[PDB]
UniProtKB/Swiss-Prot annotation:
UniProt-annotated location(s): Nucleus; Cytoplasm
Record remark on domains: The TIR domain mediates NAD(+) hydrolase (NADase) activity. Self-association of TIR domains is required for NADase activity.
Domain TIR: 3-168
Outcome of swapping E78A: Abolished NAD(+) hydrolase activity
Role: Disease resistance (R) protein that confers resistance to multiple powdery and downy mildew by promoting cell death. Acts as a NAD(+) hydrolase (NADase): in response to activation, catalyzes cleavage of NAD(+) into ADP-D-ribose (ADPR) and nicotinamide; NAD(+) cleavage triggering a defense system that promotes cell death. Also able to hydrolyze NADP(+), but not other NAD(+)-related molecules.
Gene (name only): RUN1
Binding site residues for NAD(+): R12, G13, E14, D15, T16, R17, G44
Record: active site: E78
Organism name: Vitis rotundifolia (Muscadine grape)
Identification of the protein by name: Disease resistance protein RUN1
Protein family (similarity comment): Belongs to the disease resistance TIR-NB-LRR family.
Length: 169
């Protein structure tokens, strides 16, 4: 099985592109963890084939759940693909590491709060994806990860990246 990246970074750009996810990306690189972090402007109807391919060629995914993650149908389609690989891929598997960035993990797990609010903005053309999206969020939120709240963020990122390093080896 081809492996190009150690980590695929899933995130909601409008929330975290310039700040937390950028600092996390550079911290992973400083540990020699080959990371895919999209910085292209995406305006296609569907998920870009470059992204689907990067997920398939990653040893793991890190998910930066943030307040508006579920308001993007592209983030949710990304998550479904990640959780599909988590179930199917082998030699090696595809590990998943969720970060709950200033969001309650149970809100992700149960689609409450802003994660429940998000689904009201999806019309009937997405009706068939909504059950898969909910399933992927619940599965992801049950995996062991890191709830982040207010506190010194450089030390938060240091502990996360140290933990990913030890779990990949
Ligand atoms: N084709 C697309 N692919 C991925 N994300 C998109 C796409 N179109 C819109 N988005 C996301 O939805 C937001 C609102 O778009 P618009 O105002 O044009 O309706 C964009 O800033 C972007 O959020 P993000 O940058 O967090 O990925």
């Amino acid at each position: 099985r081809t492996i190009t990246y150690d980590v695929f970074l899933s995130f909601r750009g409008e929330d975290t592109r310039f700040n937390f996810t950028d600092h996390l990306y550079s911290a992973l690189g400083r540990r020699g963890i080959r990371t895919f972090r999209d910085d292209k402007l995406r305006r296609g109807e569907a998920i870009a084939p470059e992204l689907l391919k990067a997920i398939e060629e990653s040893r793991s995914s890190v998910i930066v759940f943030s307040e508006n993650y579920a308001r993007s149908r592209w983030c949710l389609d990304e998550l479904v693909k990640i959780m599909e690989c988590h179930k199917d891929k082998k030699d090696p598997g595809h590990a998943v590491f969720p970060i709950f960035y200033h969001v309650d993990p149970s809100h992700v797990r149960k689609q409450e709060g802003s994660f429940g609010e998000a689904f009201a903005g999806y019309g009937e053309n997405l009706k068939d994806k909504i059950p898969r999206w909910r399933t992927a969020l619940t599965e992801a939120a049950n995996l062991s990860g890191w709830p982040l709240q207010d506190g010194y963020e450089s030390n938060q990122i240091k502990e996360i990246t140290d933990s990913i390093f030890r779990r990949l080896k």
